[model samples]
Target: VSKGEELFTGVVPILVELDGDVNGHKFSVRGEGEGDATNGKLTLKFISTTGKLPVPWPTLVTTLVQCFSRYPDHMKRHDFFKSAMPEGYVQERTISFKDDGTYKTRAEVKFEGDTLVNRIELKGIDFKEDGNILGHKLEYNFNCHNVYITADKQKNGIKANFKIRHNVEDGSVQLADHYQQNTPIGDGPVLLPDNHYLSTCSVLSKDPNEKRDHMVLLERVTAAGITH
Candidate 1:
C-alpha cells in the first residue's frame, strides 16, 4: 500500500432496485448497475427530501395525521383505527471501511427531477440480527411496501419510495418492543398522567390534586407492559 502502489482506487454507482409501488402511484425507476450486486459490503444512506404534498395533499397529509393521532371517543366496538406512528428507522449507516487498504469512491444517484418529484431511500429492510461477516458478504433481494417520506415543505411529496421491503429474506422480536428495555419508573404501575386515586367528590385543588381525574388512554399499551 505504498505511494506508487495500486490500491485499486475507483468510483462506481449504485442503483438499488425497489420492487413495489408508492402507495398507488408509480415513480420512474432506473439505475440498475452497481448496488446490491457487488456484495462488497456496501452501505445505504439517505438525504432528506424537499417538496410540497399532493394538491391533492389532502389525502396524503390527512391520512398521516390519522395514523399518528387518536380520534375522539365515539366507539366501543365500531370500526375505528388505532393511532400509532408508522415504524421507520432513519437511513444513515455505513459499511465499515474494509481494513484492507482498498479505496472505494462514494457513489451517487439522482431522482427524476432531482429529488422533488421523488426521492431515493429505502424502508422495510431489517435483519434477523443486523449482521454480516468476513468472507460472507450478503446480497439483498426485497419487496418494499411504503414511503420513507420527508416532512419538509418544498414539494413535499414521495421521494423514490418503496412500500415495504418484505425480506423475501429476516428479527429478534424482543428488543423491537422497547418495553423489554424499560426500567420501573419509581415503582409505578401506570404511565399515568396523574394519580390513580379518586379525591373527595368536590373537595379542593383542580390542577394540583393528587387524586385527580385521569383516563386509561393507553391501557392496551400499558397492559402490554410498555408505557409507549
Candidate 2:
C-alpha cells in the first residue's frame, strides 16, 4: 500500500470563448484573462483521500478544478434572489450563476445603504438597485483524463508512445487547454524521447446549440526523483 503521490502540479488559465446566439442574443462570454487566480490552479495527484496510492498512475488522474460557470434559467430569476439574499443587499457581486454552472450567485439585488461585498474591493454607501451579478461554480469538479503510455528503452530515438483517453461522457466536461507543437487526440499513441515534452489545447464544448468553449492544458511536468 503506497502512500498517495502527486503526479503533477500546475495552474490552468481556463481560456473560455463563448461566441454564438443564446436565445437570439449574441452571447459573448469571453474569459478575459485578467486575474484568473482562483479557478485556474490545479494539481493532479495520483493518490486517494484514504492514504493509498492507487496504481495506474501512468494513465489515470482526477483533476480538482473550479470553473467560473453560470446558471441558466432566468425566468424565475427575480423570485429566487430577493428572498435568498439578506438585508445587507451586497455590493461586490455583479453577476448571477444560478442559471449557469457555478459555485455561487447573482440576481436583481435591490438595496439600502449597508451592503458590503466580498471579492473585488468596494465600499457600501448610498442607494443601489438591481444588484445584478455574475458567478462561478468554484469547487472541486473531479474530472478524469487518461494518458496511456508504453515505455521503451532500446527502441529508436522515439523512447515511448502515448495517447489521451476521453474518460468523461460529455467530451467537453473537462474543459482541458493551449499548444506549441499540437497533436490531435484522434491521433495514435504519439512517440517521443523521455526528456521530451508535448502540450496541447483542449476545448470543453458540450452542446452545439449553446456556445460555451473552455480551454485548459495537457502535458508533462513530472519532477526530478518523482516516478513518471
TM-score of 1: 0.17
Q: Model 1, 141-196: lDDT tens per residue? A: 22212222222213211112112111111221111100001111122121211111
The lDDT values for all models are 0.17, 0.21
What are the TM-scores, per candidate, against the unseen true structure? 0.17, 0.18
Off by over 4 Å in 1: 1-130, 133-140, 154-228
Point to the candidate with the largest TM-score: 2
Give per-residue CA lDDT, model 2, range 150-188, as digits (tens). 223233111212233323333332231211111111222
TM-score of candidate 2 relative to the true fold: 0.18
Give the RMSD in angstroms, all C-alphas superposed, for model 2.
23.1
